[PDB]
Design a protein around this ligand. Structure first.
Ligand SMILES: CCCCCCCCCCCCCCCCCC(=O)OC[C@H](CO[C@@H]1O[C@H](CO[C@H]2O[C@H](CO)[C@H](O)[C@H](O)[C@H]2O)[C@H](O)[C@H](O)[C@H]1O)OC(=O)CCCCCCCCCCCCCCCCC
Ligand SMILES: CCCCCCCCCCCCCCCCCC(=O)OC[C@H](CO[C@@H]1O[C@H](CO[C@H]2O[C@H](CO)[C@H](O)[C@H](O)[C@H]2O)[C@H](O)[C@H](O)[C@H]1O)OC(=O)CCCCCCCCCCCCCCCCC
Ligand code: CLA
Ligand code: CLA
Ligand code: CLA
Ligand code: CLA
Ligand code: CLA
Ligand code: CLA
Ligand SMILES: CC1=C(/C=C/C(C)=C/C=C/C(C)=C/C=C/C=C(C)/C=C/C=C(C)/C=C/C2=C(C)CCCC2(C)C)C(C)(C)CCC1
Ligand SMILES: CC1=C(/C=C/C(C)=C/C=C/C(C)=C/C=C/C=C(C)/C=C/C=C(C)/C=C/C2=C(C)CCCC2(C)C)C(C)(C)CCC1
Ligand SMILES: CCCCCCCCCCCCO[C@H]1O[C@H](CO)[C@@H](O[C@H]2O[C@H](CO)[C@@H](O)[C@H](O)[C@H]2O)[C@H](O)[C@H]1O
Ligand SMILES: [Fe+2]
Lengths: 44, 32, 31, 66, 416, 329, 37, 53, 36, 327, 34
């Protein structure tokens, strides 16, 4: 562990895979015409 | 003409202010 | 023992702050 | 109408009176403010300070003379 | 007042009005170019040939002589005609921008949406907004390549680190290796490292500008040809105030960075037209005094750093990371070599430090640039806070106040 | 079908039912402020003296080394460090880290991150509650002042040693040395800051006295009047027209704020702008753009210098300056 | 040290910097003339 | 030189007003008047109902 | 000494990643005036 | 009404362009003379014969450096009346000995009495409680203690603040160097009240404007209480207690700092920590920020005393002037 | 009667006859008029 990018890559992976699991059931494929996206899928 | 309370109050401020303003302007031309 | 008194006073102040935050009077909205 | 004609005369007269109160040196004599050439004299090279309470008037006159 | 904004917030009425917004932006750009040309003319009108540029309160002329216009060896100013032609070119360009801005603001189309659909936009049109950003990114990448032309083909850039006192040097081998460039970008911002301010040579500068221009042009092409992804669409606010707030945050970052840049950096801001830096002036005082001591018959002036380094002692020991073109010929592998100090000392190196020590009511142009752009950067961060909050609250819909009927807090559980 | 762990985590983090709102900004705020608090308390109680100057004479700042609460401080980092990053792992020993003023760097950096995240957290809770988001802009002024006093002035001076010590007497020492070196009292931005602070106290006392004066009678003969206000009531708790009439007759009738909204904007804006300007003044004096210099501005006809009050102020600055430069030559 | 054929344009040069500032005051007097509409 | 009188000044200057405030609050809890989220007095000596009631 | 650097780096990156991925988790939707 | 007193009472309380009242008989001439006397002094009157300074616009001073300087130290605590035994009716000598300072201070002191009486009178006329008069007692206590009580305990009127911008700046550094006024716990309570009052002004104005209702009450107290309970931990729930608190903390800051100025009048200052001073004397390596501050106070005192107190004729050679080079 | 005592007596007389009595007379006049 000479360079310290393993900590950066490793931890951002673990939280990133958790975020990716949340993103999987987000039906965000359709585009919206608004100032912000109100669509957020809850409870899987 | 008008010598009421309104006249006496604001002339008590305006008369020395204009006189002082002329005196301040004269000090700007004092060579120091 | 002066530093002990100073530390006791500061820790007591922080304890009072903790109790004032978490054991405060609960605000109730009038009806 | 008479509001402006008074203030077209009295206001410049007052500004002029203030101007000729300083430029004629009357302000220095009235208030005791020294001119730039009389902060120090030939016989007095130090700061002129009042050292006695009840002789302050006399002390100033024998020190500001000439 | 019927638009919802008073006179003191009057430019907020142009958010949906695209044509008048274009007119206002072009008019402001014309004002910027007008100030540029007018200041260049003002600085060349008051320029005294014998005095250095940093003694005459010049900020715009020092930037022009860093590009190799009217420069000589050692930093001497030769001819003010290139500065004059630059100022008059910006002054002529300002009149074109001012007329176009006033036309588009006053007599042009109000909203250029029904006509000219290429120029018409909506703040929520995520495809159209990435196109404008892509076009302007391509333009900025082209502009970054104009410096590369000035550095490698047209004339050259004034290299303050050139031997003998600096000269306009043509760069033929820019540092194209991305490891060095992005290690400069990813460098620590603390002492010794200094992030991107520690660019100490022209090669790294022109190579980084090559990489930045390539990145900007490919990013502009990409933003023109693509659309925001789902994560970007769900993360951001798509409104004019939001885009203004993002630009305000970016501009605040750039303002603070440039203030510390002109305060510390010696390469892009040489100590011949901008004057010495603070650390430079302190080490100049120490070095000049050591020169006088060695001449007129040394641990009194130097000290042993714990890192195997020889640096000046006293109060200037905190500036031991200062690098100057007039110290480096006397600096070897371990720092200040005593044999190099006593023998390799040159008359050109001692006059510079003799000048810098007495130029540490005088305010250096480095101080003016640092303080002014720091002030602007902080207040632009404040503006980012204001406009980001207002954009988010206006997008959500409660920027006008809390609805008395459906108050959100009244529907929540008690806190305790 | 089962909700993901990230969804439950996001629901708990941005929950408005927590006793203290956490939020995504609080994910940065709480650990940084907690480690800064723990480090500050430990360093204030017990910490060996820090050699701030570099001439091997250390300054004691902890209670266990002969300080009281007034004189105790977390001494700034050593002059040898300057603006170098100095974590614990970059020091050869813990003793050398404590000798060079490392706890100052630790506390200051974590505190700065914590207060920026506090600004963001204030915006975040204002967003979750559906209110207008400009309280964080008001908090940006003391944050700017703390940034100028702890980070930006060391950046301009080139060393964290001349940053403000984390103590009472250290704060006074910073003020005296800053006045000696830059004449902050004659800086127009410090005048704007003093105007903002004095005016803020004036307007706070004025508004409070005006509202307290015109409270509508709802309680008994000697019961506390604060029971006359019910939490969550809709009607006004004080007579606005009576207070406005009193304030109009007090100075002149045109200066009475007929709108409570404009008055409250003025109350929120005056000390915030004043503190903004004094923060920018302190941070601009870091780059040697000092205050007004009216030294030897009056001379007589023969060239002798007549002192003014600025000359006496300069004499005080000179005394503090020659005592600050401890064996500089 | 202006160029030789344009030295007669020296006085107008010193007031060229102040024109951007008075554009800001131009916006204030325009609103004051219209009655802050 | 531990000042003996100074120790009592800190201790008794803190203990006595803390005791007075604590004693006042506890008898206020017994009377049901130790909250500000209650109505004004219905009658002399009769505290009003709490907002939650 | 290197172990302390490892743990501090991991904790700092963990909290920054929490902040970053949390603000990417459809933050503008988490407001009381949500349309649906 | 009936009786000559009632017609005067009716005329004084009549609704006109400015309220007069009975307090205006004392406030209006005294405040006009104090402000007019101050403007006269900063324009024409010098301080050459009392302080050895130029302090007027006539001598070349600007607004920052002009002042109405205190009387000479030889005057003592004399009232310095124009007809008094010092000036003896001479208006010119009255200006030179600093009689204009006692003119401004005494007429200003009766001016702030008249203004506080005016606050009582309008509150009785409108019919509200006199809490603005109680709040103004803070500035009254600060003016009375600093400009009257502090010089009355000192040697003379000379050591009072002079009515000027840079002259006040000297008075700040004078009390720091000679009294260690920053280390006084009463000034510390004053700083907490004044900075707390500015905090309360900023935080209340921001909260009201940011919890407004889109348009009885104009802002949501429930939303504001919920916001600060989760941000700060505690929050205001009573609007009446919130506004008494906005009165209390800056006024209590004025009153607490005024008590320390009274102690400073008799040199009953919090200058030193004796145990910390004794330990540094026996052990020269011991050094805290308090000990460094006492070194800066010695630097203030010795380097200003020659010119700040020219009546004493202090002659300090360079050997006895404290320096950092001699530690 | 020393000069300071005479000056004090003159000051009291002057205060009464230049400040107190004229202001009181003016107040009586404007109160009976209006
Ligand atoms: C990014 C994270 C920001 C936090 C950094 C704070 C500390 C920055 C620092 O110690 O600052 C100094 C550094 C500059 O680095 C200096 O860089 C110098 C580079 O010069 C070297 O290289 C030059 C090349 O010519 C010269 O040769 C010079 O002689 C030679 O020494 C040296 O390395 C110095 O040792 C090194 O300190 O700034 C930097 O790296 C960049 C500074 C970022 C802009 C300033 C941040 C904004 C202010 C903090 C935020 C407050 C916001 C307020 C809002 C509320
Ligand atoms: C709140 C609302 C009110 C707001 C204020 C309203 C405006 C009120 C205006 C009144 C102000 C009065 C100032 C009178 C000046 C003063 O006092 O003048 C002081 C004189 C005493 O004179 C001084 O006396 C000193 C002592 O001298 C004595 O001792 C010397 C020994 O060396 C000599 O022997 C000398 O001859 C002998 O008189 C020195 O001589 C000084 O030079 C000389 O100035 O007393 C006197 O006039 C009379 C003193 C009697 C006490 C009066 C109380 C008022 C003062 C309270 C504060 C004093 C407390 C001090 C602690 C702080
Ligand atoms: C590129 C930057 C930029 C842009 C395009 C905008 C655009 C906008 N802003 Mg935003 N803003 C910015 C930067 C910007 N702002 C910065 C840096 C701050 C922090 C100070 C703000 C804080 C801010 C607030 C608080 C408000 C806006 C508002 C607005 C809108 C109305 C414009 C207006 O009110 O003009 C009117 C211009 C004036 C009345 C003149 C202002 C001059 C001030 C008083 C002095 C500034 C100093 C100046 C240099 C003079 C100094 C002279 C010196 C020698 C003494 C408009 C959408 C309003 C908005 O929120 O509604 C949508 C509004 O209320 N802005
Ligand atoms: C950078 C400065 C700037 C610019 C470019 C603009 C731009 C604009 N504003 Mg804003 N504004 C500003 C600053 C600015 N504003 C400031 C500081 C304030 C606070 C006082 C405002 C307050 C404000 C309000 C309240 C309103 C605007 C409006 C407008 C728009 C309509 C203008 C109009 O009808 O004017 C008409 C002006 C005139 C008839 C008098 C000026 C005549 C011309 C323009 C002078 C040009 C001189 C120049 C030398 C010409 C060179 C030409 C030559 C080179 C050939 C326009 C896009 C309006 C709006 O938002 O939408 C309609 C509006 O209601 N502004
Ligand atoms: C941020 C941009 C910037 C910077 C770093 C400078 C820097 C400088 N300028 Mg320039 N200038 C600028 C923008 C800038 N200027 C603008 C926008 C104008 C139009 C008004 C000018 C017009 C101008 C003129 C006409 C002159 C300068 C001169 C100067 C120098 C002395 C400044 C001075 O006297 O302090 C004065 C300080 C202030 C006025 C501070 C008040 C700022 C507002 C504070 C409250 C907000 C200094 C090197 C002088 C010279 O030396 O160079 C030739 C000179 O004659 N400036
Ligand atoms: C940011 C720069 C910018 C942009 C995007 C626009 C936008 C536009 N302009 Mg303006 N304008 C500008 C700067 C700009 N202008 C400048 C610097 C001037 C001074 C020369 C003008 C003076 C001007 C005039 C006199 C006219 C325009 C016209 C137009 C429109 C047609 C242009 C076209 O067909 O190009 C096509 C390019 C690629 C497809 C378009 C909406 C026309 C108009 O507004 O409507 C009739 C027109 O007659 N412009
Ligand atoms: C001025 C600079 C700028 C701006 C404002 C944007 C704007 C944007 N970019 Mg682009 N980008 C840029 C420069 C820029 N880009 C350059 C120079 C490159 C080449 C390396 C890219 C390559 C790029 C990629 C690969 C992506 C973005 C993405 C984005 C979006 C989110 C960025 C983020 O959240 O972090 C946003 C619309 C993301 C998006 O989803 O597409 C629009 C994304 O995935 N950008
Ligand atoms: C009052 C407003 C004001 C004024 C008068 C200035 C003035 C200045 N700023 Mg500041 N700025 C401001 C507001 C202002 N700024 C604000 C509010 C911010 C955000 C906080 C900034 C952010 C900022 C940054 C980040 C920087 C400046 C810099 C500068 C200086 C140079 C500007 C420049 O070169 O742009 C040039 C802009 C262009 C678009 C020109 C591009 C031309 C590219 C090609 C150049 C020609 C090429 C080399 C040769 C081509 C031909 C050849 C091939 C033959 C100048 C003194 C710079 C400085 O030197 O340090 C402080 C700098 O780095 N400004
Ligand atoms: C819309 C509007 C606005 C705006 C406007 C603007 C902003 C404008 C701009 C404009 C501009 C920006 C302009 C410019 C101009 C310029 C000019 C017109 C130029 C000319 C030039 C010349 C003439 C030159 C000459 C010369 C030479 C060549 C050489 C040297 C000398 C001289 C310099 C002389 C306002 C706000 C007001 C109001 C509202 C509306
Ligand atoms: C020119 C030059 C150079 C440079 C180069 C380069 C290549 C650069 C680049 C640069 C870069 C490359 C930059 C980047 C940046 C980035 C950034 C700045 C970022 C930011 C981000 C953001 C802003 C985000 C945010 C967020 C989060 C975090 C979460 C969610 C939400 C949001 C999205 C908001 C050098 C120095 C070498 C040298 C000299 C010259
Ligand atoms: C864009 C905002 C940038 C903010 C940066 C800070 C600006 C505010 C600083 C105000 C005081 C600056 O003061 C600095 O510039 C003044 C320019 O006249 C000079 O100050 C001096 O100016 C004149 C002589 O030159 C004289 O009136 C005085 O001796 C003095 O006022 C000094 O060079 C320096 O004291
Ligand atoms: Fe209120």
């Amino acid at each position: 562990d000479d360079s310290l990018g393993f900590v950066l890559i490793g931890v951002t992976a673990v939280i990133g895979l958790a975020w990716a699991q949340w993103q999987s059931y987000q039906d965000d494929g359709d585009d919206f015409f608004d100032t912000y996206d109100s669509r957020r899928a809850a409870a899987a | 003409p008008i010598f009421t309370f309104r006249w006496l109050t604001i002339h008590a401020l305006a008369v020395p202010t204009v006189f002082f303003l002329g005196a301040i302007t004269s000090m700007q031309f004092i060579q120091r | 023992m002066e530093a002990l008194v100073y530390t006791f006073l500061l820790i007591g102040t922080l304890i009072v702050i903790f109790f004032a935050i978490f054991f405060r009077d609960p605000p109730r909205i009038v009806k | 109408i008479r509001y402006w004609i008074i203030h077209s005369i009295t206001i410049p007269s007052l500004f002029v009176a203030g101007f000729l109160f300083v430029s004629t040196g009357l302000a220095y004599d009235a208030f005791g403010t020294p001119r730039p050439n009389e902060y120090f004299t030939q016989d007095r090279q130090q700061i002129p300070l009042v050292n006695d309470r009840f002789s302050a008037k006399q002390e100033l006159e024998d020190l500001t003379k000439g | 007042e019927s638009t919802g904004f008073a006179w003191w917030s009057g430019n907020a009425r142009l958010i949906n009005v695209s044509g008048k917004l274009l007119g206002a932006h072009v008019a402001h750009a014309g004002l910027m170019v007008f100030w540029c040309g007018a200041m260049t003319l003002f600085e060349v009108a008051h320029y005294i040939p014998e005095k250095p540029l940093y003694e005459q309160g010049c900020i715009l002329i020092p930037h022009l002589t860093t590009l190799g216009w009217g420069v000589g060896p050692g930093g001497e100013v030769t001819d003010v005609y290139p500065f004059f032609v630059v100022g008059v070119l910006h002054l002529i360009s300002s009149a074109v921008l001012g007329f176009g801005g006033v036309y588009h603001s006053l007599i042009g189309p109000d909203t250029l949406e029904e006509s000219f659909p290429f120029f018409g936009y909506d703040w929520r049109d995520k495809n159209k907004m990435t196109t404008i950003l892509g076009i302007h990114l391509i333009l900025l990448g082209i502009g970054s390549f104009l410096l590369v032309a000035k550095a490698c083909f047209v004339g050259g850039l004034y290299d303050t680190w050139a031997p003998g006192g600096g000269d306009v040097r043509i760069v033929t081998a820019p540092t194209l290796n991305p490891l060095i460039i992005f290690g400069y970008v990813l460098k620590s911002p603390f002492g010794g490292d200094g992030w991107i301010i520690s660019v100490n040579n022209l090669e790294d500068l022109v190579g980084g500008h090559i990489w930045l221009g390539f990145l900007c042009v490919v990013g502009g092409i990409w933003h023109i040809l693509t659309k925001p992804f789902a994560w970007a669409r769900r993360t951001f606010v798509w409104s004019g105030e939001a885009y203004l707030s993002y630009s305000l945050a970016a501009l605040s970052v750039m303002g603070l960075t440039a203030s510390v840049f002109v305060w510390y950096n010696n390469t892009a801001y040489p100590s011949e037209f901008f004057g010495p830096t603070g650390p430079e002036a302190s080490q100049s005082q120490a070095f000049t005094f050591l020169v006088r001591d060695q001449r007129l018959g040394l641990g009194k002036y130097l000290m042993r750093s714990p890192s195997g380094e020889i640096i000046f002692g006293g109060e200037t020991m905190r500036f031991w990371d200062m690098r100057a073109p007039w110290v480096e010929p006397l600096r070897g592998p371990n720092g200040l070599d005593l044999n190099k100090i006593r023998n390799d000392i040159q008359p050109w190196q001692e006059r510079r430090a003799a000048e810098y020590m007495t130029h540490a009511n005088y305010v250096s142009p480095r101080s003016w640039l640092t303080t002014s752009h720091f002030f602007l950067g902080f207040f632009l961060w404040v503006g980012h806070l204001w406009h980001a909050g207002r954009a988010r609250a206006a997008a959500a819909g409660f920027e006008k106040g809390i609805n008395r009927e459906n108050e959100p807090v009244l529907s929540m559980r008690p806190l305790d | 079908e089962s909700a993901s762990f990230w969804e439950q985590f996001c629901a708990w983090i941005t929950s408005t039912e927590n006793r203290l709102y956490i939020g995504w900004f609080g994910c940065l705020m709480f650990p940084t402020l907690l480690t800064a608090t723990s480090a500050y308390i430990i360093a204030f109680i017990a910490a060996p003296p820090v050699d701030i100057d570099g001439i091997r004479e250390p300054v004691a700042g902890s209670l266990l080394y002969g300080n009281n609460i007034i004189s105790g401080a977390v001494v700034p980092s050593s002059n040898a460090i300057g603006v170098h990053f100095y974590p614990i792992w970059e020091a050869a020993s813990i003793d050398e880290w404590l000798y060079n003023g490392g706890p100052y760097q630790l506390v200051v950096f974590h505190f700065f991150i914590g207060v920026c995240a506090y600004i963001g957290r204030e915006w975040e809770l204002s967003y979750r509650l559906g209110m207008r988001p400009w309280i964080c802009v008001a908090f940006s002024a003391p944050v700017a002042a703390a940034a100028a006093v702890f980070v930006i002035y060391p950046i301009g001076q080139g060393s964290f040693s001349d940053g403000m010590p984390l103590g009472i007497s250290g704060t006074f020492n910073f003020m005296l040395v800053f006045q000696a070196e830059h004449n902050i009292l004659m800086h127009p931005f410090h005048m704007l800051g003093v105007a903002g602070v004095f005016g803020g106290s004036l307007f706070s006392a004025m508004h409070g006295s005006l509202v307290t004066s015109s409270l509508i009678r709802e309680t008994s003969e000697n019961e506390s009047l604060n029971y006359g206000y019910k939490f969550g009531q809709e009607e006004e708790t004080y007579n606005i027209v009576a207070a406005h009439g009193y304030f109009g007759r007090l100075i002149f009738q045109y200066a009475s704020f007929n709108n409570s909204r404009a008055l409250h904007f003025f109350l929120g804006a005056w000390p915030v702008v004043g503190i903004w300007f004094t923060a920018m003044g302190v941070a601009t004096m870091a780059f040697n753009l000092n205050g007004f210099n009216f030294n030897q501005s009056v001379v007589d006809s023969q060239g002798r210098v007549i002192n003014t009050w600025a000359d006496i102020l300069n004499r005080s600055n000179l005394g503090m300056e020659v005592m600050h430069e401890r064996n500089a030559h | 040290a202006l160029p030789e054929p344009y030295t007669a344009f020296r006085p107008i040069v010193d007031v060229m910097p102040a024109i951007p500032v008075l554009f800001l005051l131009l916006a204030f007097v325009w609103q004051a003339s219209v009655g802050f509409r | 030189e531990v000042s003996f009188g100074a120790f009592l000044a800190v201790i008794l200057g803190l203990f006595i007003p803390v005791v007075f405030l604590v004693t006042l609050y506890i008898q206020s809890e017994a009377q049901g008047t130790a909250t500000n989220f209650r109505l004004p007095d219905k009658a002399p000596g009769v505290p009003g109902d709490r907002y939650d009631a | 000494m290197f172990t302390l650097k490892i743990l501090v780096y991991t904790v700092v990156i963990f909290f920054i990643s929490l902040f970053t991925f949390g603000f990417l988790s459809s933050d503008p939707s988490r407001n009381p005036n949500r349309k649906d | 009404d009936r009786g000559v007193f009632d017609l005067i009472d009716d005329w004084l309380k009549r609704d006109r362009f400015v309220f007069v009242g009975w307090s205006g008989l004392l406030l209006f001439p005294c405040a006009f003379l104090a402000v007019g006397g101050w403007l006269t002094g900063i324009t024409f009157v010098t301080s050459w014969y009392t302080h050895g300074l130029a302090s007027s616009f006539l001598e070349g001073c600007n607004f920052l450096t002009a002042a109405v300087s205190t009387p000479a130290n030889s005057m003592g605590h004399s009232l310095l009346l124009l007809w008094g035994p010092e000036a003896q009716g001479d208006i010119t000598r009255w200006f030179q000995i600093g009689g204009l300072w006692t003119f401004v201070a005494l007429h200003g002191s009766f001016g702030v009495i008249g203004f506080c009486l005016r606050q009582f009178e309008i509150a009785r006329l409108v019919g509200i409680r006199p809490y603005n008069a109680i709040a103004f007692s803070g500035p009254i206590a600060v003016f009375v203690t600093v400009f009257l009580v502090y010089p009355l305990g000192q040697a003379s009127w000379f050591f009072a603040p002079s009515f000027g911008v840079a002259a006040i700046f000297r008075f700040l550094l004078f009390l720091q160097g000679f009294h260690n006024w920053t280390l006084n716990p009463f000034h510390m309570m004053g700083v907490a009240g004044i900075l707390g009052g500015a905090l309360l002004c900023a935080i209340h104005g921001a909260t009201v404007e940011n919890t407004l209702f889109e348009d009885e009450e104009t802002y949501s107290m429930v939303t504001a209480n919920r916001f600060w309970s989760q941000i700060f931990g505690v929050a205001f729930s009573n609007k009446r207690w919130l506004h008494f608190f906005m009165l209390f903390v800056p006024v209590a800051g004025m009153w607490t700092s005024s008590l320390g100025i009274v102690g400073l009048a008799l040199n009953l200052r919090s200058y030193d920590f004796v145990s910390q001073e004794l330990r540094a004397a026996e052990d020269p390596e011991f050094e805290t920020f308090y000990t460094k501050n006492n070194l800066l106070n010695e630097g203030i005192r010795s380097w200003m005393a020659a010119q700040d107190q020219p009546h004493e004729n202090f002659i300090f050679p360079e050997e006895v002037l404290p320096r950092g080079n001699a530690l | 009667m020393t000069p300071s005592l005479s000056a004090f007596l003159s000051s009291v007389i002057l205060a009464v006859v230049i400040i107190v009595i004229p202001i009181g007379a003016a107040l009586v006049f404007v109160s009976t008029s209006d």
